[PDB]
Amino acid sequence: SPMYSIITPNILRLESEETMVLEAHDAQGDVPVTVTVHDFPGKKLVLSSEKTVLTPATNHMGNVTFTIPANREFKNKFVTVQATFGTQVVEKVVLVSLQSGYLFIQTDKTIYTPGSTVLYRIFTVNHKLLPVGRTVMVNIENPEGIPVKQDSLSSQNQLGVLPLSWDIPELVNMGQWKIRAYYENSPQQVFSTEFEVKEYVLPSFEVIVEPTEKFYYIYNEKGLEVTITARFLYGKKVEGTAFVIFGIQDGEQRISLPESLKRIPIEDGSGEVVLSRKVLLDGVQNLRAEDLVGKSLYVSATVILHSGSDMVQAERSGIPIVTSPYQIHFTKTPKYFKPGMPFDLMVFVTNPDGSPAYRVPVAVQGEDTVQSLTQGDGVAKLSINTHPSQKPLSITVRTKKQELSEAEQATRTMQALPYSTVGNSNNYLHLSVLRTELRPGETLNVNFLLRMDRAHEAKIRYYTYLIMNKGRLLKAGRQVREPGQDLVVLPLSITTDFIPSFRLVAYYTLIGASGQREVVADSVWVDVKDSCVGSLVVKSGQSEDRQPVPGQQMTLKIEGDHGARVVLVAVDKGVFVLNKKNKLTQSKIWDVVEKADIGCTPGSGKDYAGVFSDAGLTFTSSSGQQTAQRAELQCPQP
């Protein structure tokens, strides 16, 4: 008997195009199609009504696009979607909500002084990162929270850029000021950026004191090595002498170490001083070396110029003393694994202070051959093949840096559960993808792999795949399969429409051995490089044959998308470096977009319905196969 299927995003948005996927399986001829959406409580009115015809030429594959008007006729608002498949009818109730947009606030500097001017821009975008003309309110608040400046702007005809400037008086509250921006329509969402006012300070020259490592290891005989760097305000280096003294810190009491006072020559502008382990151990007159764990050290340095008598001071407080510096976590692993097929992990190793680690080997326990090296972002990607039974899989990861002992290495344990077969039929689908970062213009080969008994293999002739991006449904299609083949490769092009990580959901349906219907599905999450759809590059138009000289004219060249609006600002680079806490970068923008995805589970679910719901999809068929209704606007906490 023919089976008719309907697929649509889990959450529908007002005033935005929404794609509905319609299918007929084992249906001859062509079938007319009419899809309508009504109010859930009573089906009083029609919000939209579209029609199409599914032809056997396209394998009964159809996609109908509709827009839900912002009528606001009724009130978690639901709408029922009813599709008439010839005589047959399939109905599914889907949640509805609206999103407003995003605001990005750019400030030239994060530390000002009383008297200077604050320059900030507001960028207005929608869910697709496109300029939009709305009305936005901008406020500036002092540390006490009293709005000192209030503005009401409209970005219409401004191409989504709003410039603003504020003049700091000579006598202002000193602390951490904030800027609040929100659309007038939806004041529930406020975007904030903060800066500091501070007080006028200007030393003779800059000195930076930092250790090579980010912590101290007790059993490290090399000691703690610190690199003192000095350079003038105009760029040239400093040659002089630096007096450095270390000191333990037991919570809030500084038991300064007298024997560790050293005098070092700063040549070329950089020095180096080592604290011996013996000195530190004898300073606290404690025979136990482990007793110093948790007692952070600090370094005080005093640089004295060789020409005159200029003196500046630097400090670096909070160098932890740790015996297990690295802590290990899982980030984007699925939780359900198809038994007997490879399982992909992902691991994140962080320093004691919470920063990502770098070149820390990781390895699963007991396999020893699945090693890797932690990358710049702290992510290490591994793969482990799974057992053929259906007992849960326990996987343990450990860092294997050589300096520490086995008992001091990080360790994290996770348990995964098998994918639930519909009728213990041992029918599975597997999607294998490259576990790296792609770029637009590259081509991705997805290997559809199928396992089942050699008695119903010939009854499957195709796979259907759907691509989810930014919550919306990107594209669908078919993968015709010649009978007898287990592995089928889909060559998939990657364009700028895939710039944030997309998701691929594939499935096949067949009649069961007993006589019922069967739907088997799998999904994968694929991450591609985060970059703008267009391009923007600033370089020097003039011939590069001279270092720039003060007061002279310089020519700049900006290359970008035609008709775009480019905005510039120049900063000292002394305040840019300390702005590492938060900068306006494309990665941050795409992360902000990625925080509003419909589905949150990485790549699998317990059942086929779990797979379809986790990816942010719904699937209803004329038979008794459907996915559970979702009512919450945010999935449970991780």
Partner 1 sequence: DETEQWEKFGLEKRQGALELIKKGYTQQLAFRQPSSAFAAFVKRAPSTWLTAYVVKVFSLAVNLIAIDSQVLCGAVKWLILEKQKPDGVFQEDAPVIHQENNNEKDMALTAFVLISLQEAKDICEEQVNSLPGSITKAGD
Ligand X SMILES: *[C@@H]1O[C@H](CO)[C@@H](O)[C@H](O)[C@H]1NC(C)=O
Please give the residue ranges that form the binding site for partner 1 (CB under 8 A): 142, 144, 146-150, 167, 169-173
Distances from the Cα of 267 to the Cα of 56, 346, 483, angstroms: 81, 45, 75
541 binds, among ligand X, partner 1, none (CB under 5 to 8 A by kind): none
The helices-and-strands tally (H runs, E runs) of the chain is: 4, 45
Tokens of 471: 């919550």
Looking at the Cβ atoms of 2 and 114, the one nearer to partner 1 is 114
Distances from the Cα of 587 to the Cα of 499, 518, 576, angstroms: 11, 41, 17
Going across the sheet that includes 176-183, the strands are: 147-154, 135-141, 176-183, 191-196
Q: Which stretch binds ligand X (CB under 6 A): 69-77, 361-369, 471-479, 555-563?
A: 471-479
Beta bridge partners of 418: 337
Q: Which stretch binds ligand X (CB under 6 A): 183-191, 278-286, 473-481, 597-605?
A: 473-481
Check residue 262 for interaction with ligand X (CB under 6 A): no
Looking at the Cβ atoms of 148 and 434, the one nearer to partner 1 is 148
Residue type, 561: D
Looking at the Cβ atoms of 152 and 553, the one nearer to partner 1 is 152
Looking at the Cβ atoms of 114 and 131, the one nearer to partner 1 is 114
List of residues 6+ apart from 367 with CB closer than 8 A: 384
Q: Which stretch binds ligand X (CB under 6 A): 172-180, 246-254, 469-477, 542-550?
A: 469-477
Per-residue contact flags (x/-) with ligand X for residues 6 to 25, judged by CB under 6 A: -------------x------
Instruction: Report which DSSP code applies to 515.
Output: S
Check residue 475 for interaction with ligand X (CB under 6 A): yes
For 53, counting Cβ atoms within 10 Å of its Cβ (0-12 exposed, 13-18 middle, 19+ buried), the class is exposed
567 binds, among partner 1, ligand X, none (CB under 5 to 8 A by kind): none
Minimum distance, C-beta of residue 466 to ligand X, in the bound complex (Å): 8
Residue type, 592: V
Q: Which of 92, 81, 96 is nearest to 34 (CA)?
A: 81
Looking at the Cβ atoms of 4 and 465, the one nearer to ligand X is 465
Looking at the Cβ atoms of 476 and 584, the one nearer to ligand X is 476
Looking at the Cβ atoms of 19 and 100, the one nearer to ligand X is 19
Q: Is the distance from CB of 333 to CB of 346 less than 8 angstroms?
A: yes
Rounded CA gap, 523 and 465, in Å?
Answer: 9
Which residue lies nearest ligand X, judged by its C-beta? Answer: 63
Minimum distance, C-beta of residue 476 to ligand X, in the bound complex (Å): 4
b/e burial code for range 133-161 (CB count within 10 A of at least 16 → b)? ebebebbbbbeeeeeeeeeebebeeeebe
280 binds, among ligand X, partner 1, none (CB under 5 to 8 A by kind): none
Per-residue contact flags (x/-) with ligand X for residues 48 to 87, judged by CB under 6 A: ---------------x------------------------
Tokens of 341: 């097929």
Among 476, 490, 511, 513, which residue sits at the site for ligand X (rule: CB under 6 A)? 476
Minimum distance, C-beta of residue 16 to partner 1, in the bound complex (Å): 36
Minimum distance, C-beta of residue 167 to partner 1, in the bound complex (Å): 8
199 binds, among partner 1, ligand X, none (CB under 5 to 8 A by kind): none
Looking at the Cβ atoms of 244 and 492, the one nearer to ligand X is 492
Rounded CA gap, 140 and 151, in Å?
Answer: 9
List of residues 6+ apart from 72 with CB closer than 8 A: none
Secondary structure element (H or E) that encloses residue 608, with its range: helix 608-614
Rounded CA gap, 234 and 572, in Å?
Answer: 11
Q: Which of 318, 273, 307 is nearest to 205 (CA)?
A: 307
76 binds, among partner 1, ligand X, none (CB under 5 to 8 A by kind): none
Q: Which stretch binds ligand X (CB under 6 A): 287-295, 374-382, 472-480, 534-542?
A: 472-480
Looking at the Cβ atoms of 146 and 287, the one nearer to partner 1 is 146
Distances from the Cα of 317 to the Cα of 45, 226, 350, 508, angstroms: 67, 12, 20, 60
Looking at the Cβ atoms of 146 and 201, the one nearer to partner 1 is 146
At residue 183, the 3 state secondary structure works out as strand
Q: Is the distance from CB of 162 to CB of 124 less than 8 angstroms?
A: yes
Looking at the Cβ atoms of 30 and 151, the one nearer to partner 1 is 151
Secondary structure element (H or E) that encloses residue 467, with its range: strand 462-469
**Radius of gyration over every alpha carbon of the chain, rounded to an integer in angstroms:** 31
444 binds, among ligand X, partner 1, none (CB under 5 to 8 A by kind): none
Minimum distance, C-beta of residue 21 to ligand X, in the bound complex (Å): 7
| Count of other CB atoms within 10 angstroms of residue 166 | 16
The size of the interface with ligand X (CB under 6 A), counted in residues, is 5
Looking at the Cβ atoms of 151 and 527, the one nearer to partner 1 is 151
144 binds, among ligand X, partner 1, none (CB under 5 to 8 A by kind): partner 1
Minimum distance, C-beta of residue 200 to partner 1, in the bound complex (Å): 16
Looking at the Cβ atoms of 177 and 525, the one nearer to partner 1 is 177
15 binds, among partner 1, ligand X, none (CB under 5 to 8 A by kind): none
142 binds, among ligand X, partner 1, none (CB under 5 to 8 A by kind): partner 1
Tokens of 607: 């059942």
Looking at the Cβ atoms of 52 and 142, the one nearer to partner 1 is 142
Rounded CA gap, 153 and 408, in Å?
Answer: 57
Minimum distance, C-beta of residue 150 to partner 1, in the bound complex (Å): 6
Tokens of 361: 């080997």
Minimum distance, C-beta of residue 166 to partner 1, in the bound complex (Å): 10
Direct distance between the N- and C-terminal alpha carbons of the chain, in angstroms, rounded to an integer: 41
Secondary structure element (H or E) that encloses residue 83, with its range: strand 78-85
Looking at the Cβ atoms of 364 and 468, the one nearer to ligand X is 468
Q: How many CA atoms lie within 13 A of 408 on its CB side?
A: 13
b/e burial code for range 306-315 (CB count within 10 A of at least 16 → b)? eeeeeebebe
Minimum distance, C-beta of residue 474 to ligand X, in the bound complex (Å): 7
148 binds, among ligand X, partner 1, none (CB under 5 to 8 A by kind): partner 1
Minimum distance, C-beta of residue 171 to partner 1, in the bound complex (Å): 5
Per-residue contact flags (x/-) with ligand X for residues 106 to 145, judged by CB under 6 A: ----------------------------------------
Tokens of 185: 């329509």
Rounded CA gap, 323 and 404, in Å?
Answer: 8
Rounded CA gap, 329 and 5, in Å?
Answer: 40
63 binds, among partner 1, ligand X, none (CB under 5 to 8 A by kind): ligand X
274 binds, among partner 1, ligand X, none (CB under 5 to 8 A by kind): none
Residues at the site binding ligand X, with contacts judged by CB under 6 A: 19, 63, 473, 475-476
